[PDB]
Design an enzyme around this catalytic site. Structure first.
Site, mmCIF file in Angstrom:
data_model
loop_
_atom_site.group_PDB
_atom_site.id
_atom_site.type_symbol
_atom_site.label_atom_id
_atom_site.label_comp_id
_atom_site.label_asym_id
_atom_site.label_seq_id
_atom_site.Cartn_x
_atom_site.Cartn_y
_atom_site.Cartn_z
ATOM 1 N N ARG A 115 0.775 -1.233 0.000
ATOM 2 C CA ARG A 115 0.000 0.000 0.000
ATOM 3 C C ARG A 115 0.807 1.284 0.000
ATOM 4 O O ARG A 115 1.965 1.317 0.413
ATOM 5 C CB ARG A 115 -0.946 0.000 1.208
ATOM 6 C CG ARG A 115 -1.639 1.331 1.515
ATOM 7 C CD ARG A 115 -2.669 1.153 2.621
ATOM 8 N NE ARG A 115 -3.336 2.400 2.982
ATOM 9 C CZ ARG A 115 -2.843 3.318 3.814
ATOM 10 N NH1 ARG A 115 -1.661 3.149 4.404
ATOM 11 N NH2 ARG A 115 -3.540 4.425 4.045
ATOM 12 N N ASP A 124 0.536 1.047 8.613
ATOM 13 C CA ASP A 124 1.628 0.084 8.691
ATOM 14 C C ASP A 124 1.838 -0.217 10.164
ATOM 15 O O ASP A 124 1.886 -1.369 10.578
ATOM 16 C CB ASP A 124 2.915 0.655 8.096
ATOM 17 C CG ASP A 124 2.804 0.918 6.617
ATOM 18 O OD1 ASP A 124 2.487 -0.031 5.878
ATOM 19 O OD2 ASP A 124 3.038 2.070 6.192
ATOM 20 N N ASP A 154 6.587 -1.571 5.388
ATOM 21 C CA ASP A 154 5.322 -1.612 4.675
ATOM 22 C C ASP A 154 4.585 -2.928 4.841
ATOM 23 O O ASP A 154 5.156 -4.013 4.711
ATOM 24 C CB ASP A 154 5.533 -1.317 3.191
ATOM 25 C CG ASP A 154 5.974 0.098 2.951
ATOM 26 O OD1 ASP A 154 6.037 0.855 3.938
ATOM 27 O OD2 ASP A 154 6.253 0.463 1.798
HETATM 28 N N1 LIG Z 1 -10.702 8.083 4.661
HETATM 29 C C1 LIG Z 1 -9.371 7.878 5.246
HETATM 30 N N2 LIG Z 1 -8.527 8.117 4.438
HETATM 31 C C2 LIG Z 1 -7.267 7.759 4.856
HETATM 32 O O1 LIG Z 1 -6.325 7.257 3.973
HETATM 33 C C3 LIG Z 1 -6.952 7.919 6.264
HETATM 34 C C4 LIG Z 1 -8.134 7.725 7.120
HETATM 35 N N3 LIG Z 1 -9.332 7.487 6.520
HETATM 36 N N4 LIG Z 1 -7.859 6.831 8.138
HETATM 37 C C5 LIG Z 1 -6.949 7.102 9.091
HETATM 38 C C6 LIG Z 1 -5.642 7.431 8.433
HETATM 39 C C7 LIG Z 1 -5.170 8.803 8.906
HETATM 40 N N5 LIG Z 1 -4.534 9.564 7.815
HETATM 41 C C8 LIG Z 1 -3.951 10.891 7.977
HETATM 42 C C9 LIG Z 1 -3.367 11.454 6.814
HETATM 43 C C10 LIG Z 1 -2.761 12.736 6.956
HETATM 44 C C11 LIG Z 1 -2.734 13.463 8.205
HETATM 45 C C12 LIG Z 1 -2.072 14.769 8.196
HETATM 46 O O2 LIG Z 1 -0.829 14.803 8.227
HETATM 47 N N6 LIG Z 1 -2.779 15.940 8.169
HETATM 48 C C13 LIG Z 1 -2.144 17.249 7.875
HETATM 49 C C14 LIG Z 1 -3.124 18.001 7.076
HETATM 50 C C15 LIG Z 1 -2.429 18.864 6.019
HETATM 51 C C16 LIG Z 1 -2.318 20.391 6.293
HETATM 52 O O3 LIG Z 1 -3.338 21.108 6.260
HETATM 53 O O4 LIG Z 1 -1.194 20.874 6.545
HETATM 54 C C17 LIG Z 1 -1.556 18.044 9.097
HETATM 55 O O5 LIG Z 1 -0.327 18.051 9.308
HETATM 56 O O6 LIG Z 1 -2.342 18.665 9.847
HETATM 57 C C18 LIG Z 1 -3.343 12.871 9.369
HETATM 58 C C19 LIG Z 1 -3.949 11.581 9.245
HETATM 59 N N7 LIG Z 1 -5.830 7.320 6.900
HETATM 60 C C20 LIG Z 1 -4.786 6.529 6.199
HETATM 61 O O7 LIG Z 1 -5.222 5.381 5.433
HETATM 62 N N1 LIG Z 2 5.422 -0.030 11.832
HETATM 63 C C1 LIG Z 2 6.126 1.101 11.975
HETATM 64 N N2 LIG Z 2 6.883 1.298 13.108
HETATM 65 C C2 LIG Z 2 7.612 2.433 13.287
HETATM 66 N N3 LIG Z 2 7.583 3.386 12.323
HETATM 67 C C3 LIG Z 2 6.854 3.255 11.176
HETATM 68 C C4 LIG Z 2 6.089 2.077 10.973
HETATM 69 N N4 LIG Z 2 5.493 2.198 9.817
HETATM 70 C C5 LIG Z 2 5.832 3.371 9.286
HETATM 71 N N5 LIG Z 2 6.667 4.022 10.117
HETATM 72 C C6 LIG Z 2 7.269 5.388 9.861
HETATM 73 O O1 LIG Z 2 6.247 6.293 9.395
HETATM 74 C C7 LIG Z 2 6.530 6.789 8.084
HETATM 75 C C8 LIG Z 2 5.344 6.390 7.187
HETATM 76 O O2 LIG Z 2 5.729 6.591 5.825
HETATM 77 P P1 LIG Z 2 5.178 5.677 4.645
HETATM 78 O O3 LIG Z 2 5.393 4.241 4.889
HETATM 79 O O4 LIG Z 2 5.752 6.101 3.354
HETATM 80 O O5 LIG Z 2 3.627 5.944 4.642
HETATM 81 P P2 LIG Z 2 2.437 5.288 3.881
HETATM 82 O O6 LIG Z 2 2.200 3.905 4.342
HETATM 83 O O7 LIG Z 2 1.248 6.136 4.093
HETATM 84 O O8 LIG Z 2 2.924 5.269 2.340
HETATM 85 C C9 LIG Z 2 7.863 6.174 7.650
HETATM 86 O O9 LIG Z 2 8.835 7.176 7.333
HETATM 87 C C10 LIG Z 2 8.378 5.326 8.813
HETATM 88 O O10 LIG Z 2 9.680 5.721 9.282
HETATM 89 MG MG LIG Z 3 4.042 2.211 3.915
#
Ligand SMILES: Nc1nc(=O)c2c([nH]1)N=C[C@H](CNc1ccc(C(=O)N[C@@H](CCC(=O)O)C(=O)O)cc1)N2CO
Ligand SMILES: Nc1ncnc2c1ncn2[C@@H]1O[C@H](COP(=O)(O)OP(=O)(O)O)[C@@H](O)[C@H]1O
Ligand SMILES: [Mg+2]
Length: 164
Positions: A115, A124, A154
């Site tokens: 993903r 993750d 991941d």
């Molecule tokens: N519908 C849904 N979509 C998703 O993919 C999502 C969700 N549910 N379920 C829980 C997590 C949470 N995902 C998140 C993604 C980004 C931020 C975040 O960093 N927010 C920013 C907003 C940007 C801004 O305005 O600056 C921040 O820093 O405040 C927080 C939670 N998630 C994942 O599957």
């Molecule tokens: N299971 C975990 N335990 C500790 N840190 C994690 C874990 N999974 C992700 N992270 C941290 O959080 C960040 C998530 O980034 P990323 O994997 O690219 O996000 P996404 O799954 O949304 O693509 C990574 O930089 C990593 O260092």
């Molecule tokens: Mg990932």
């Protein structure tokens, strides 16, 4: 292709989707979803999500299919910026293993079913606690397919239900 570049690209292609197509792809997907569950009425509590940046939507009849089968739908809530938890409508929180199936929202996915989320890492992190081999199903439009190398952290999704 660098998780960040592939995010902006897919995320943008998804934001440019026309209401009619989106509608046509969500209908299809929700139906594959109903046909996916029925053959295994063992799921009593399922993990969903609240569609945001134009993600695949969960349709009315899907929520009815869960209603007449007494399946509980729990949603993700970010605690701090560290971890997320799942709660239901009455706001009671269900532990990781109290959940029989996870329907996960995503930005993209590669050939190995890994993903690509928003880059926070909540899923993750969370999905590592599952010790019941619960199904981790990714929900997505067929064009969210992307080429990116997975990191050691991941989590690999078991199935990717899409419009195909
Ligand atoms: N519908 C849904 N979509 C998703 O993919 C999502 C969700 N549910 N379920 C829980 C997590 C949470 N995902 C998140 C993604 C980004 C931020 C975040 O960093 N927010 C920013 C907003 C940007 C801004 O305005 O600056 C921040 O820093 O405040 C927080 C939670 N998630 C994942 O599957
Ligand atoms: N299971 C975990 N335990 C500790 N840190 C994690 C874990 N999974 C992700 N992270 C941290 O959080 C960040 C998530 O980034 P990323 O994997 O690219 O996000 P996404 O799954 O949304 O693509 C990574 O930089 C990593 O260092
Ligand atoms: Mg990932």
């Amino acid at each position: 292709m660098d998780k960040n570049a592939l995010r902006k690209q897919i995320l943008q292609k998804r934001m440019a989707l026309s209401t009619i197509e989106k509608s046509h792809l969500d209908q299809k997907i929700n139906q594959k979803l109903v046909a996916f569950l029925t053959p295994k009425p063992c799921i009593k509590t399922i993990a969903l999500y609240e569609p945001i940046k134009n993600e695949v939507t969960f349709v009315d009849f899907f929520f009815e299919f869960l209603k007449i089968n007494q399946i509980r739908a729990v949603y993700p809530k970010v605690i701090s910026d560290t971890e997320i938890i799942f709660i239901d409508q009455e706001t009671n929180t269900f532990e990781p293993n109290q959940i029989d199936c996870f329907l996960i929202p995503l930005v993209g996915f590669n050939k190995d079913n890994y993903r690509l989320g928003f880059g926070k890492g909540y899923y993750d992190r969370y999905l590592m606690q599952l010790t019941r081999q619960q199904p981790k199903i990714g929900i997505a439009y067929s064009f969210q397919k992307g080429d990116f190398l997975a990191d050691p952290w991941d989590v690999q999704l078991d199935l990717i239900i899409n419009d195909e």
